[PDB]
Ligand binder design. Structure first.
Ligand SMILES: CC(C)Oc1cc(N2CCNCC2)ccc1-c1c(C(N)=O)[nH]c2cc(F)c(F)cc12
Ligand SMILES: [Mn+2]
Ligand SMILES: [Mn+2]
Length: 365
């Protein structure tokens, strides 16, 4: 079976034997002492431990192939004049088809981020949002796919005006640096220090103003767990080591602003607190909403548009109740100062026993 244009064929139909394309495979970086970690590639113990988790890497690979094909399609049509809603719906319709959405077993890991300009992350339009993409907008497309809760967290920046080219270059180089420095037994702060050094080596000129690119210090790379976008370990920009078999989202953000984000605009993104157990609720609308969340999302993130498409209405008070009880956490848009520009690149990497796999790498980024 061959993929259509626009893509509509599920990835699992393109690979019937259930064996999906590998991402970029990298030898681990050498230690401080200069001795290589190349021994991992040829170790019989490492090869066996790697093959024991083959089904897991395979689920990430299926989700990464859906991500590559969705984003290549997005790049062919994303244009100024389109509303943010139109962009998110057209992207998500394709994502659901390629991932072969099946309740909590395959689907969308989190809402389509399409944060603009000074806003770096966690903006997706809510119903009635009339925002239109502009020629001068710097748009961060951040979307997620999953197979059995094996999440692909992967993002890029969309622009139409060449004035942002050097800012995009700086961030892409910083993300790629973070990915290269990542490895088993590597200290998380060393990855962060490598990212910062590369990011700040760039100076950019935008509309007659110059800036030294700043990494956003409170938007960090993180570990990923099953059905858990952020598994608790962070790659800090400003003791903890990466371990064998861990999975990371290596993401970096460059800014012309303060290099710090704050909560701004209305909230669209929400997610159940992973650690909260069963909570009995009698309030009817609140109980119904939590059941809708448990059935459709579990511990994966969602947005208000995703409740609307399920035929839910008059749920805002119910959603506020779940947030106030600590069952659900709101994730509002995170923005730098007015007039600033932010850019992002992100990949998911597998710290396999034998090698480091940039599972979401494409020919694009
Ligand atoms: C605010 C921050 C940028 O992102 C997070 C912080 C957390 N927390 C850390 C501290 N401990 C509590 C959880 C968890 C999850 C995220 C998060 C990420 C991510 N980091 O890539 N992507 C998402 C998408 C969503 F739709 C969502 F709803 C949440 C996220
Ligand atoms: Mn992301
Ligand atoms: Mn992330």
């Amino acid at each position: 079976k061959v993929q259509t244009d626009p893509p509509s064929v599920p990835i699992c139909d393109l690979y019937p034997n259930g064996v999906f394309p590998k991402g970029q495979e990298c030898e681990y970086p050498p230690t401080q002492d200069g001795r290589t970690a190349a021994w991992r590639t040829t170790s019989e113990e490492k090869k066996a431990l790697d093959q024991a988790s083959e089904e897991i890497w395979n689920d990430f690979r299926e989700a990464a192939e859906a991500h590559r094909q969705v984003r290549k399609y997005v790049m062919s049509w994303i244009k100024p004049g389109m509303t943010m809603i139109e962009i998110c719906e057209k992207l998500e319709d394709c994502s659901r088809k390629l991932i072969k959405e099946n309740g909590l077993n395959a689907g969308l890991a989190f809402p389509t981020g399409c944060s603009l300009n000074n806003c770096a992350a966690h903006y997706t339009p809510n119903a009635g949002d009339t925002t239109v993409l502009q020629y001068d907008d710097i748009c961060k497309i951040d979307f997620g796919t999953h197979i059995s809760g094996r999440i692909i967290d992967c993002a890029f920046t969309v622009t139409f005006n060449p004035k942002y080219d050097t800012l995009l270059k700086a961030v892409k180089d910083a993300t790629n640096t973070g990915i290269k420095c990542a490895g088993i037994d590597v200290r998380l702060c060393d990855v962060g220090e490598a990212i910062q050094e590369v990011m700040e080596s760039y100076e950019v000129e935008i509309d007659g103003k110059t800036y030294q690119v700043k990494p956003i210090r409170n938007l960090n790379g993180h570990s990923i767990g099953q059905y858990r976008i952020h598994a608790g370990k962070t790659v800090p920009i400003v003791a903890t080591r990466m371990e064998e078999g861990e999975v990371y989202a290596i993401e970096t953000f460059g800014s012309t602003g303060k290099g710090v984000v704050h909560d701004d605009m209305e909230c669209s993104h929400y997610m159940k607190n992973f650690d909260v157990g069963h909570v009995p609720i009698r309030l009817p609308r609140t109980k119904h909403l939590l059941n809708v969340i448990n059935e459709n999302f579990g511990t994966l993130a969602f947005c208000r548009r995703w409740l609307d498409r399920l035929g839910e209405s008059k749920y805002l008070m119910a959603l506020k109740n779940l947030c106030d009880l600590g069952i659900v956490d709101p994730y509002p848009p995170l923005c730098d100062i007015k007039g600033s520009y932010t850019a992002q690149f992100e990949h998911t990497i597998l710290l396999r026993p034998t090698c480091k796999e940039v599972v979401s790498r494409g020919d694009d980024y």
